[PDB]
Amino acid sequence: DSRVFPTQRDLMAGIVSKHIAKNMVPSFIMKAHESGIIHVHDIDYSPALPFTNCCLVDLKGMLENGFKLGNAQIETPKSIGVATAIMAQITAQVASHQYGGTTFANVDKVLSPYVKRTYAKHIEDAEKWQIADALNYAQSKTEKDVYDAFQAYEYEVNTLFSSNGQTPFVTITFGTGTDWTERMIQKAILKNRIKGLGRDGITPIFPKLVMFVEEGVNLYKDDPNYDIKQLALECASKRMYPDIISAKNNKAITGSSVPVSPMGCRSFLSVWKDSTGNEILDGRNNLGVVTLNLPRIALDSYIGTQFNEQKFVELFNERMDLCFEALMCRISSLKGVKATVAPILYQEGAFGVRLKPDDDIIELFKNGRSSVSLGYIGIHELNILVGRDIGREILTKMNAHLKQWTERTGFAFSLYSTPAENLCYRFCKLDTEKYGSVKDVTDKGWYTNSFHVSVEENITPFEKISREAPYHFIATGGHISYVELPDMKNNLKGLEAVWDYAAQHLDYFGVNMPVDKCFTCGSTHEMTPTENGFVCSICGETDPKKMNTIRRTCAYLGNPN
Amino acid sequence: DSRVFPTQRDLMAGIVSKHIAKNMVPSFIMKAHESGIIHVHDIDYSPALPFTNCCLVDLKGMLENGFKLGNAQIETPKSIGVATAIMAQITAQVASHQYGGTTFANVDKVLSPYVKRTYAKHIEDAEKWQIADALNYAQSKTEKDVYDAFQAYEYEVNTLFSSNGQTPFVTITFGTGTDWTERMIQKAILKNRIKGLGRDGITPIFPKLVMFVEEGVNLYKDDPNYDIKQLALECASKRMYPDIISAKNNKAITGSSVPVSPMGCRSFLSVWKDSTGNEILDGRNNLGVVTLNLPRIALDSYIGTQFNEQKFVELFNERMDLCFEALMCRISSLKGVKATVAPILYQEGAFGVRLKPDDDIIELFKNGRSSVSLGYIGIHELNILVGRDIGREILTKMNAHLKQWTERTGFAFSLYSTPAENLCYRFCKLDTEKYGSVKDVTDKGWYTNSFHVSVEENITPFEKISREAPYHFIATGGHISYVELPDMKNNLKGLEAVWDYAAQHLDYFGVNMPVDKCFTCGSTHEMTPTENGFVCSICGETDPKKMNTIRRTCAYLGNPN
Numbered sequence A, B: 001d002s003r004v005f006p007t008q009r010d011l012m013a014g015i016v017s018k019h020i021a022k023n024m025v026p027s028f029i030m031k032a033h034e035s036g037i038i039h040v041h042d043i044d045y046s047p048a049l050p051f052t053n054c055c056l057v058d059l060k061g062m063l064e065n066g067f068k069l070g071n072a073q074i075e076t077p078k079s080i081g082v083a084t085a086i087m088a089q090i091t092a093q094v095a096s097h098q099y100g101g102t103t104f105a106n107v108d109k110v111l112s113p114y115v116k117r118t119y120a121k122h123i124e125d126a127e128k129w130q131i132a133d134a135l136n137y138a139q140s141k142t143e144k145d146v147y148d149a150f151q152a153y154e155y156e157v158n159t160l161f162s163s164n165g166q167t168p169f170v171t172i173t174f175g176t177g178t179d180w181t182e183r184m185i186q187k188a189i190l191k192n193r194i195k196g197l198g199r200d201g202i203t204p205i206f207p208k209l210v211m212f213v214e215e216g217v218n219l220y221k222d223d224p225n226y227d228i229k230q231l232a233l234e235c236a237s238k239r240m241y242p243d244i245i246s247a248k249n250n251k252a253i254t255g256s257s258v259p260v261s262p263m264g265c266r267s268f269l270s271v272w273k274d275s276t277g278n279e280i281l282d283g284r285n286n287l288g289v290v291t292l293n294l295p296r297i298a299l300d301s302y303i304g305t306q307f308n309e310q311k312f313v314e315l316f317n318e319r320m321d322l323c324f325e326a327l328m329c330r331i332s333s334l335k336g337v338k339a340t341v342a343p344i345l346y347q348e349g350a351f352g353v354r355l356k357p358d359d360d361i362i363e364l365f366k367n368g369r370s371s372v373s374l375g376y377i378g379i380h381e382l383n384i385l386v387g388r389d390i391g392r393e394i395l396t397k398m399n400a401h402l403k404q405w406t407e408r409t410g411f412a413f414s415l416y417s418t419p420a421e422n423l424c425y426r427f428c429k430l431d432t433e434k435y436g437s438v439k440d441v442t443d444k445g446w447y448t449n450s451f452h453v454s455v456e457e458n459i460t461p462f463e464k465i466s467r468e469a470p471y472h473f474i475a476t477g478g479h480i481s482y483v484e485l486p487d488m489k490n491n492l493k494g495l496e497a498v499w500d501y502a503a504q505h506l507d508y509f510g511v512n513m514p515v516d517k518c519f520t521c522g523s524t525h526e527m528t529p530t531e532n533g534f535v536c537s538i539c540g541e542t543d544p545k546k547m548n549t550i551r552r553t554c555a556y557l558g559n560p561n
């Protein structure tokens, strides 16, 4: 919250950490950050301490083998419910040793073997107690245990604070599983999500859910998991998640044999092979984000009221170099740092390899294993400032610099569509301090996310997907597209048509709908917006404590007041 | 640990908090703390933030009714396993909003109703599936669910870090329960503890276990839970805990109709009644500890090499006043503080009453509800310095000051036998900086705990209990007695004789034995101590990673290196 104790403690460390960063980070990089030329993310954590950002947790390797967690040498779980109980504790622990999001990829496949152990236990109990209908007891009890295991997970993640006093920022993916255990997990996740959280069944912010969609798996009428696709459509319409990823487009962009889950919100690894040619996903991470204020490049290239193309080329080149220096500055902090810093990450399997206590952690990140993020924002406002559409062109050129950086250093730089929940305002506020109200750019008080078409443009779902799709193939380090839609709870067919179009043309996709609930009557209709707050169409209730109203106005779900 | 991330963050807040305390706390109090005249505990937390110390969590009230926990409006659990899963999350949350220990009192009684719901569910499943042996299916499955629920608890508490990067400091009491559900919980706790933690079955530091012992319940051959007493003796001999409390002596000292569990290690409330005359235990807390260096009073009253009684009376009176000023200083910090600071504690039931967000938290503590702790230490070294035994006499006089303080302020001051894990060295080191090596006092490098007879005195178990017993009736705010014993795993009868003697004469009691395990062979015999480390009698292994060696050399269990 803010005045809550663990948050206050965290703010104290955050302040000490900003001060230490002022002594570690070269002046020109700091100055560029204060002025809003760039944005060095997570300065209240790094480089004062050698934290990394987000990751794909290697849960499979952890669970299969042993691993130490806290003071406890955990063994392979022998039931599904214990497996997600351990998954929940790893969630809290990983969140406390990085400043970014934690992702568990393909939990349907990974947790499958523990649903199998639960099933065998009940089969053993059907013989032990002379149960007449044996195959129906084992299945029915297993269905219940799995439902309960993922209710446990969803609640644990919403009832525990990490180091920083907040609920852990975690995402869960699924959808490539077709075996009966893998189907059951997916239905359990989606059904718990539909039921909602707590007494009143509210819409949770976390975990993020993302489902993979593929032809031959869950995309068309005839596919095996097509019933699960319909469950997911109902869930999306009541609770926003799950977002979907097109397995086909995802693998083309990443170069991966299997769909690549996003770390945190939408950071994507590209394909990487270990020393024996195996494709590795789980365990890999991102080292940080620096974000380039693209509108500011253009604003600073104005001479009078007129754009100067030559000036723009000079500052662009100069600012790209600058961003490399900022990104490299923090990676340099990681030199000499030992694996004692975060045993759960480095010693015990979360990052997929066991380092010894006295090993340097940075060697793990080298030669393309970890990604590193050059963010950007405000293509819409860039296009207005330069007078034409240069989005695909400037982003393609940014990739060309990134390739050079990758080859000079060994670190795998990628272009990242910064989620920028509040950075949209920060950059605009600082650009306003210099240039004032500029028509169509700073006047509204925010910059538009990445390559997204303006939220104030009159466009259909289908035409927005088309305009945005090309960018998923360019900003390979991170991207998503949203479409705004009304209540779709009694129009699952229209929603599905937008999913299918999205899955055909782009990588990662979500749909922003209104998800409201009046507690006193029970209406799940969209509330109408007053100047005071929200109001119930059918009853007329206006108390915030007697309703749940969730939008995704930017990146995360939240209540808009 | 130390270089582990959440710990480093916590150290940053701890440093900022010490600095803020330097601006909040009057100079004379700070100076007295630097010099080791007194010790203001937890200065790295309070008064920079308005934390409190330890508590008895009102789990019963929380579970029975609703309560919000994190973002989730939790409902009454409908199974035992969910109940301890919620108990585990409350543990982590309470630990993060106070700087002291969390206690769940009488978990056998409190969690009983959820064992009853689990039993009814399996009875319902015996009819649903035509199970031949119905009463034996429900009982056998319930036994398993309870075992699993308390394995879940013991592991959750050892696999989660609170705000401060440490495993939560938590204690669990039981033993007054005689119903079949309450027996089953006690056996589950004790059996999990016996099995140990993890792959290798190591001895856990936490949770602390304390069992109540009473005539007519579990003390003599004919008592109903006498079998549980034997389970507890076996557990104590393999894992140190459980400590025991004499229900009879405990109620006489506290004035309570039911046995009073210790908050954290050994802070005891005295009896208190709400506005309608009900005796309240659960929800109540302690506001902090200031500890009086008793040897230093005597050392500072030496004129040449000779004790001056008159000087001792003057500094004693002056230092008691000083301690009141230090204790009151931090309680003053709590004025104006609102319940938004810690919703789990103040709004949602942990402290047993629901305050509104805009309510002041200090009113909850007034008029005897919360205790406040005047610690002391080193009676043994005090007796040497003054030339005679003045322990019962000086402590009785300290109570007389405390009664005056209580009547002037409304806050319930009590005399507290400071556990002083490392304060035993701190005080001795600072007293040495002034007076050097003093025979029998500072020469060994530590002061003896509270009223405990010297750890270097040749005395039997029974004679140590007798010497120490009177002090449990005087230092009512906190006390314990230890006895040192050899391996007692194949002598449960000798151990029981010491428990019975203890239960007759004193309040709260534990037995320090050696609990070692060699992993390579499996010996549970006492390891022999070398200058290098520990060594296995029968095999000869010396690697610390291939063994588990636990002592209680002071207060907590730990590995001595």
Ligand SMILES: Nc1nc2c(ncn2[C@H]2C[C@H](O)[C@@H](COP(=O)(O)OP(=O)(O)OP(=O)(O)O)O2)c(=O)[nH]1
Binding pocket: A040, A041, A042, A043, A420, A421, A422, A423, A424, A425, A426, A429
């Ligand atoms: N002007 C303005 N700045 C804000 C607001 N909320 C947060 N900021 C600032 C503080 C942060 O350094 C920066 C970005 O915050 P975000 O919410 O986008 O992400 P986050 O809090 O994780 O910060 P970070 O990306 O790690 O720097 O913007 C706001 O309402 N207005």
Ligand SMILES: Nc1nc2c(ncn2[C@H]2C[C@H](O)[C@@H](COP(=O)(O)OP(=O)(O)OP(=O)(O)O)O2)c(=O)[nH]1
Binding pocket: A147, A148, A151, A152, A153, A155, A156, A159, A198, A199, B073, B074, B075, B076, B077, B078, B079, B082, B085, B086, B089
């Ligand atoms: N913290 C936490 N809360 C849970 C867990 N499982 C359920 N809850 C929450 C949600 C409910 O508000 C409350 C009561 O839940 P239940 O005992 O009814 O759990 P469940 O639905 O799995 O069993 P049920 O089908 O109702 O018999 O506790 C868990 O593993 N951890």
Ligand SMILES: Nc1nc2c(ncn2[C@H]2C[C@H](O)[C@@H](COP(=O)(O)OP(=O)(O)OP(=O)(O)O)O2)c(=O)[nH]1
Binding pocket: B040, B041, B042, B043, B420, B421, B422, B423, B424, B425, B426, B429
């Ligand atoms: N001389 C000396 N002082 C120590 C050692 N370890 C800790 N201290 C200091 C720092 C603490 O302010 C003080 C008491 O520490 P304790 O381990 O008894 O308890 P705790 O860490 O909870 O500190 P506190 O009671 O809150 O001040 O003694 C040591 O090995 N030697």
Ligand SMILES: Nc1nc2c(ncn2[C@H]2C[C@H](O)[C@@H](COP(=O)(O)OP(=O)(O)OP(=O)(O)O)O2)c(=O)[nH]1
Binding pocket: A073, A074, A075, A076, A077, A078, A079, A082, A085, A086, A089, B147, B148, B151, B152, B153, B155, B156, B159, B198, B199
């Ligand atoms: N974090 C956590 N660990 C648990 C829990 N229950 C058991 N564990 C740990 C201890 C073991 O090292 C490992 C595997 O435990 P199990 O799946 O065998 O649990 P349990 O003994 O209740 O079932 P079982 O009798 O073996 O079929 O996980 C829990 O609720 N939370």
Ligand SMILES: [Mn+2]
Binding pocket: A078
């Ligand atoms: Mn097991």
Ligand SMILES: [Mn+2]
Binding pocket: B078
């Ligand atoms: Mn339920």
Ligand SMILES: [Zn+2]
Binding pocket: A518, A519, A520, A521, A522, A523, A536, A537, A538, A539, A540, A541
């Ligand atoms: Zn309504």
Ligand SMILES: [Zn+2]
Binding pocket: B518, B519, B520, B521, B522, B523, B536, B537, B538, B539, B540, B541
């Ligand atoms: Zn051995």
